[PDB]
Amino acid sequence: AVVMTQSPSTLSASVGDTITITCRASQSIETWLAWYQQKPGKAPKLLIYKASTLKTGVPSRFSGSGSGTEFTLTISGLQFDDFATYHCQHYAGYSATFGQGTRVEIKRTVAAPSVFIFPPSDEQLKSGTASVVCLLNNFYPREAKVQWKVDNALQSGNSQESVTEQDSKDSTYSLSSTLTLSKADYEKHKVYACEVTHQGLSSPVTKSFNRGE
Amino acid sequence: EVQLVESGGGLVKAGGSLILSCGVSNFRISAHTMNWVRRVPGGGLEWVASISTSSTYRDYADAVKGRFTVSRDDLEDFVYLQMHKMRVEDTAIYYCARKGSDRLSDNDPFDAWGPGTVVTVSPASTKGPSVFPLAPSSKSTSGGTAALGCLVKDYFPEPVTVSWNSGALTSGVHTFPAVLQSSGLYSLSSVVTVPSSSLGTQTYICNVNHKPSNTKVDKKVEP
Ligand SMILES: CO[C@H]1O[C@H]([C@H](C)O)[C@@H](O)[C@H](O)[C@@H]1O
Ligand SMILES: [Cl-]
Ligand SMILES: [Cl-]
Ligand SMILES: [Cl-]
Ligand SMILES: [Cl-]
Ligand SMILES: [Cl-]
Ligand SMILES: [Cl-]
Ligand SMILES: [Cl-]
Ligand SMILES: [Cl-]
Ligand SMILES: [Cl-]
Ligand SMILES: [Cl-]
Ligand SMILES: [Cl-]
C-alpha cells in the first residue's frame, strides 16, 4: 500500500546543469529509498540506497536526500553519461514499489515532425502482404500521435510504432508507424492516410495516397 | 481424482529455450519422485528427467543431459523443466508423471500422468530478412526534402545492420529499433532524407547485413 510518486516524468536539460528529481511516498518510509539509473535495453543500476548512501563506484555528482515522505535525487553538473531514466524505489523486507521513472533528455526548441508516407512495394505485394509506412521525422518533444485511416475508417490493432533515441546532433526524435495488411485487405480500399498530431503542429497533418495511383 | 497439468509449450526455434511447469490436484508431490516423459511423433515414449524427494537426485536421458534442468517446489506443489539449446528431435508431447503406487515402495511405476503439452522445435535457428524499397515520391516530400528507405522484414534473431551506398551516405540516416511481430520475426525500416533535387542525380542502395544467418542484401531504391 505504499505508493511512490516521481516528478517530473520527463526532465529536459543541458550538459553542465544541476538537476533535481523528486520522489514522494504516500506514507512515511523512514530512509528506505533507493535510486536506480537505467539506459535503454540495459538493466537498472543501483546508484543510491538508504536515501543518501552512494553505492561504491558512483561519482559524487549524484546525491540523494530526504526522509519520511519526500526524497530528492540531485545531479550536479550533468554529463552525457547521465542522460538516462532514473527510478526511485521503496524497499521493504518482502516487497518493493517503484516510482514511474524520470527520463532525462537534452532540451531544445519545439520542432514539428515532417511527415512522409510510403505505399507497399509492388515486390512485397506479390508475396501477399502490404506494409504501409508513415515516417515522422526530426521532431521534438517525443510525444506524438499517429492514426491510420483507410477510406476514412480509423484503424486499430494492425500497426506498430518504433522511435529513435534522441539525435546526437539536433536533439530530435523520429518515429515510424507501420500498417500491415494482407494483400486481399489492402486491395479492398482506396485511400490510405497517416494523420499526425504533435505540439509543433497547429492542427494535425495528414499524408495520404490512393492505392495504385 | 488425482490430476496433473503441464503448462508452457508451443513453438521454439532450434537453439532456443522453453520452460515447462507441472501443477497437481488432490495430492502433495513431496512424497513422490516426479518425472518428465515425452511422446515423439513416431509414437514411442521417451523418459526425459527424474527428480527425487527433497531434490537429492536429478537424473536425465543421455539425449538431454547438460541442456535440461528439472526442479521442484514441494511447498506449492510444482515441478519445472528448463529446456535449453533445443533441437528438432526435442519435438514431442511432454507429460509430467508421478512415480507411485497404491502403497509406496522403493521402485513404483508411473501411476498418474498429465494430459501433455505440445512442444515443437523448428529446424531453422535463423532466418535472413526480406528487403523492400520505401520509394521516394511526392507523398514522401516535405518542403525541399525527400525521404526514402528500406523495409527490412521477417528476420530472426536480431540484429541486422543497415548502411547506405556502402557507407558513403550517413547524413540524414535513421535506422529504427526492430519490432517483434506477432509472427515471431523481427522487422525494422531504415530511412534517409535527402534534398528533393538530388533524386535522379544518384543511386541509393541500402546494404543490409544479417550476421546470424550470414545473409547480405543490397537493395536499390528508386526513383
Ligand atoms: C520415496 O518414494 C518415492 O520415490 C520412490 C523411488 C526412490 O523413486 C518411488 O518408487 C515412490 O513411488 C515415490 O515416488
Ligand atoms: Cl561498472
Ligand atoms: Cl532513456
Ligand atoms: Cl509535412
Ligand atoms: Cl525532415
Ligand atoms: Cl511492424
Ligand atoms: Cl508432437
Ligand atoms: Cl498402481
Ligand atoms: Cl494412470
Ligand atoms: Cl517446424
Ligand atoms: Cl551528419
Ligand atoms: Cl553477414
**A1-107 placed in CATH 3.40.50.2300:** no
C-alpha–C-alpha distance, residues B216 and A83, integer Å:
34
Domain coordinates of chain B in residue numbers? 1-124, 125-223
Q: What is the largest CA-CA distance in chain A?
A: 67
Beta-strand pair B186-195/A159-163:
unpaired
Q: Which CATH architecture has domain B1-124?
A: Sandwich (2.60)
Nearest CA to B173 out of B131, B205, B142 is that of: B205
Contact between B154 and B198 (Cβ < 8 Å): no
Coil, helix or strand at residue B165: helix
Cα separation, A68 vs B130, in Å, equals 56
Position of cell 540524414?
B172
CB-hemisphere CA count at 13 Å for A75?
A: 26
| Residues with Cβ within 8 Å of residue B199, at least 6 apart in sequence | B136, B146, B223
**A108-211: same fold as A1-107?**
yes
Nearest ligand to the C-alpha of residue B121? 10
**Any B CB within 8 A of A56 CB:** no
Taking the CA atoms of B100, B101, B105 and B109 in sequence, report the sign of the dihedral they define: negative
Q: Do domains B1-124 and B125-223 have the same CATH topology?
A: yes
Element (H, E) at A12: strand A10-13
In A, which residues are within 8 Å of B177 by CB distance? 162-164
Fold of B125-223: Immunoglobulin-like (2.60.40)
Residue B132 and residue A208: Cβ atoms within 8 Å?
A: no
**CB-nearest partner of A114 from B130, B142, B174:** B142
**What experiment produced this structure?**
X-ray
Question: Does the distance separating the beta carbons of A119 and B132 come in below 8 Å?
Answer: no
Rounded CA gap, B33 and B35, in Å?
7
**Rounded Cα distance, B58 and B35, in Å:** 10
Nearest residue of A to residue B221, measured between CA atoms: A121
- Residue in the structure block whose three cell numbers are 540531485: A74
Query: Sign of the CA dihedral A37, A38, A44, A45?
Result: negative
CA–CA gap between residue A209 and residue B191 (Å, rounded): 19
**Nearest residue, CB atoms, A116 vs list B133, B140, B178:** B140
Rounded distance between C-alpha atoms, residue B3 and residue B11, angstroms: 25
What is the architecture, at CATH level 2, of domain A108-211? Sandwich (2.60)
Segments making up each domain of chain A, as ranges: 1-107, 108-211
